[PDB]
Amino acid sequence: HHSGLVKMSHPSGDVEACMVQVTCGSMTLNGLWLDNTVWCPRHVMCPADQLSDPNYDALLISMTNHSFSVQKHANLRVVGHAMQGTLLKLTVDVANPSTPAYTFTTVKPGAAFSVLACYNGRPTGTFTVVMRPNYTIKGSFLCGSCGSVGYTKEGSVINFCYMHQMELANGTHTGSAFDGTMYGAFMDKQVHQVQLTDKYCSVNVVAWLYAAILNGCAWFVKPNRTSVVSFNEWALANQFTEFVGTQSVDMLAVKTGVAIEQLLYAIQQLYTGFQGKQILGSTMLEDEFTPEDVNMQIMGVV
Amino acid sequence: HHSGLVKMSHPSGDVEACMVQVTCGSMTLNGLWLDNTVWCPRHVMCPADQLSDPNYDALLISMTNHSFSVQKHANLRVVGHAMQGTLLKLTVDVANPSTPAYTFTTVKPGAAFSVLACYNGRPTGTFTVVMRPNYTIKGSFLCGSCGSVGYTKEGSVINFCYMHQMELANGTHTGSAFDGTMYGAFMDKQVHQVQLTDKYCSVNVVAWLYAAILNGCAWFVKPNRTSVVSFNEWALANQFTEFVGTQSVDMLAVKTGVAIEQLLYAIQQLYTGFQGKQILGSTMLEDEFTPEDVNMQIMGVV
């Protein structure tokens, strides 16, 4: 029985109309054109032959407005340049007439967001990811994809949360918030960097087990219960995040009549082994679907 | 090590500008507005209290142009109505100024395509699926989503291949081609229908194993070989599709130096058990990624 659960992205049209190409010297990547501002990663200033441990403060000073070329696939004349953390803020002379209603925000581990992968200012695909507990995402990014953006949507308002910067040695990806900070302890330097350990997102595992119940698959449900506090102590020893419930999890508990604390116990047992049984066609726990995804795609509740 | 492989959809903007709401009597669903034509599922004519085994020929005759209301979220005046298989073809007085370059086509089992899920003429998410060997897809569709469309893209040209019609008892979905035929032996009737058995898509499994090698995971590779002909005889007895190679598979064979016939042997062995080992973090074979996906997302080859 198919769960009805898929990796679902926001429609990308509104963001598509905001993507531009930014070139500086030997380097080309993507930017995001909102109002009179173009945001892009600051390593566009960096000579393609010196991306290792660059001095961005000095590269910045060396640039003038004419050092930047912004192109929509039109030329947008740059009339101002600034650096905020790991991002540039270029002011251009034309405001984007397709600028949507938007905010900036910072996404938290466990939460999902949509990504528009672009090359040369040209959108090429969209996908959705969860921010891992070690502040990477498991994306699909190649050379020339920096500046691609990740975003959520609430109603008509687009909440930009991510601008892609780099790949780590283990094939996962990270980038910046639009306040210029990198997610995690990462730096936009092409050198060896420690990576924090990943973890299962307990809340998303709970969501997944609820999805299974909503699909009639409930063999893992016993009357036994672990409290939230005792789960969280267990979790620290076991590479799960600590669980923090939400209203969306409460809704699932109500629709199913199965308590969070019964699924926490179930997780503790399934972690040691499924024992031949499957769950929604899987033999390991799934933490890539959020309580919100389950509520929306299975129950029609946004 | 993350493969770099994700479920990737085309950017949806071009199709978003083609979606409308179609209402007839008690029923509302989505349509696709290209040129002066709006396509939508024919059960929009069916009284919401009689969707079981309807007589569409008689419902059709009972309609006039004013029986249909088309709305873009504008009102498009209907000046012609026709039925082609399981689809209506409404002619409207305004041509869609955002009509992209397009074709119609029919997607084949194993092949991937992007879906724009809409409700009330309003796009709400996008995702990508593979056409299963029993001519269902594992989608995420609720009431009011009929008329959502699936499509591929070649360059700038959008190839429409699917208009959503129904959910089956096992939670999978099917619909029509734009020639009006349903995929498989399905009928657009809300009654019990046999369902063919699903199968692993051998070609996509081969793609997946190649992806694993490209990510450094090659323990399942032995010098042993099964020919294509002997695999295909095995496959019929084992709920795999018969394998049919393509140029995109040949490219992967060349990049890796590992022959198709070595991975066919590997599949025959992994089918009986992985034996504790994993493959790209999975303990079962994966057939949701195509040779094209692997070439594009891992190697930069379209």
From Swiss-Prot, chains A, B:
Taxonomic superkingdom: Viruses
Peptidase C30 domain location: 3-302
Active site: 43, 146
Catalytic reaction(s) noted: TSAVLQ-|-SGFRK-NH2 and SGVTFQ-|-GKFKK the two peptides corresponding to the two self-cleavage sites of the SARS 3C-like proteinase are the two most reactive peptide substrates. The enzyme exhibits a strong preference for substrates containing Gln at P1 position and Leu at P2 position
Task performed by this protein: Cleaves the C-terminus of replicase polyprotein at 11 sites. Recognizes substrates containing the core sequence [ILMVF]-Q-|-[SGACN]. Also able to bind an ADP-ribose-1''-phosphate (ADRP).
Designated name of the protein: 3C-like proteinase nsp5
Organism: Middle East respiratory syndrome-related coronavirus (isolate United Kingdom/H123990006/2012)
Residues of the full protein shown: 3248 to 3551 of 4391
